[PDB]
Ligand binder design. Sequence first.
Ligand SMILES: N[C@@H](Cn1cc(I)c(=O)[nH]c1=O)C(=O)O
Ligand SMILES: N[C@@H](Cn1cc(I)c(=O)[nH]c1=O)C(=O)O
Ligand SMILES: [Zn+2]
Ligand SMILES: [Zn+2]
Ligand SMILES: [Zn+2]
Ligand SMILES: [Zn+2]
Lengths: 258, 258
Amino acid sequence: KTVVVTTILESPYVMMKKNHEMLEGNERYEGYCVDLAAEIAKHCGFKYKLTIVGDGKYGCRDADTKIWNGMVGELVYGKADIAIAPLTITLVREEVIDFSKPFMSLGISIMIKKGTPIESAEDLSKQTEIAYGTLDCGSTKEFFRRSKIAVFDKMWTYMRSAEPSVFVRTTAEGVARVRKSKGKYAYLLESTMNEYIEQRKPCDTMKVGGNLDSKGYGIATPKGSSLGNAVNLAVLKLNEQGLLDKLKNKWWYDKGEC
Amino acid sequence: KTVVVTTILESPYVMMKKNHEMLEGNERYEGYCVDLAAEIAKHCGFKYKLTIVGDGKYGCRDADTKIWNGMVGELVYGKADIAIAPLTITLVREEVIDFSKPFMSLGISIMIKKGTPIESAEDLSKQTEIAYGTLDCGSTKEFFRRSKIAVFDKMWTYMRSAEPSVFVRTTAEGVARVRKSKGKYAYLLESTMNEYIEQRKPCDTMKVGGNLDSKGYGIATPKGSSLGNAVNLAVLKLNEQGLLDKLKNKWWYDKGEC
Ligand SMILES: N[C@@H](Cn1cc(I)c(=O)[nH]c1=O)C(=O)O
Ligand SMILES: N[C@@H](Cn1cc(I)c(=O)[nH]c1=O)C(=O)O
Ligand SMILES: [Zn+2]
Ligand SMILES: [Zn+2]
Ligand SMILES: [Zn+2]
Ligand SMILES: [Zn+2]
């Protein structure tokens, strides 16, 4: 009956409202993905419950046990009916779960503390004074681990063995590390987040260079789910009616602080 | 056994080779989608025959007869097994054919003859001296026909009723009309084509403003095709390995004339 939605606390996709503690259920949250969830449930006509992914992760497969974690795991093992989050459509995931067509297009990008002498991935790869890393257990890390491109493989070789670890558990941790690093840590992260942070106080970071790749976020369902067809059509309808563009401007720039 | 591929003569996706009269079968053609077709077939392990869509159209549904034409029609009526072309993923098409995840991301954009006093769709809609139109029988025309956004519906109201027709049969016709117009015609077209033309002699056009929307091109198969699954995985794998980025570079910029 009630669809269980798995999602992740990631601003501005899903955030606790300022007055959350006296709110209940889905009303405790706000954001792009909260709005998107409401729109999809309205067009597909279902009731739903937003639940924050227990382990706070997007999803990766343990190399030894072969068990999936994060939001991907919640679908694979039947703990959730649908994931509505900034979840990257990838080949290894497509083999275990289903994705709608993308609701957002983006790429990997570089975040620096303002004034950092870096302008590109090539710049990062050719020096050692400035540390750099990525989010753990996500598509960005896997991009570098799997890259054959000389600069990206060179970066991976450094990142894989760097001490202390250049990888972070959450996006907020990566961003804090940039801000506190005095310009000695750069962060590789998805472009739309880089762009969001750039317009938030204290306005001390910026995106440099173009995107390293191109990819999309999709709505995910368990393989063979009776929900997947309708959800995919709903995403296309929403895009075509301009709602996705409407939501982006609402959460990204109408709230810009810089 | 041999998979019939429907595609469209649209530079630089599919072009006749200079000496095509001396060649046979698939070797008559070159371009982005020719290269992509060869790679999809290699990875999925099938033999294939490239065929040019008979009516030279992408695909629209006749309002009265309800019959699909163009490449979409070839798949709907079983004349082709797969379409590998700059074919836009849309809701109405997804209702009758299947698409892979996108192999290219793009949006509707404005092409001007250099010097034309236009910077945005808002600019176009608020003036009358410069005419503007789109490709007929495609996703761009349908975007304007269906839009509830004030600026775009105003543009549609003008375009639908303009005489002579501001719509064109092929991309080349639209570009030619811009070039011959002395600034008095602007062309609305997909961004990646706008970008390609900007790098073609006589280097007298340019893209202005941001994109009007966001969408993708996908490989299409008939509903229920056994090919669908494997083709989608192939597209994801090729994106992740950088092939699609390499093919754009090859056909757009390595060959740039400006
Ligand atoms: N979208 C990713 C997770 N994710 C998120 C951000 I924001 C990032 O900078 N890198 C990531 O891998 C996924 O689905 O694994
Ligand atoms: N891709 C479109 C066709 N198409 C192509 C170009 I190049 C354009 O500027 N506009 C279009 O509608 C579709 O599939 O209808
Ligand atoms: Zn609280
Ligand atoms: Zn709606
Ligand atoms: Zn010829
Ligand atoms: Zn190959």
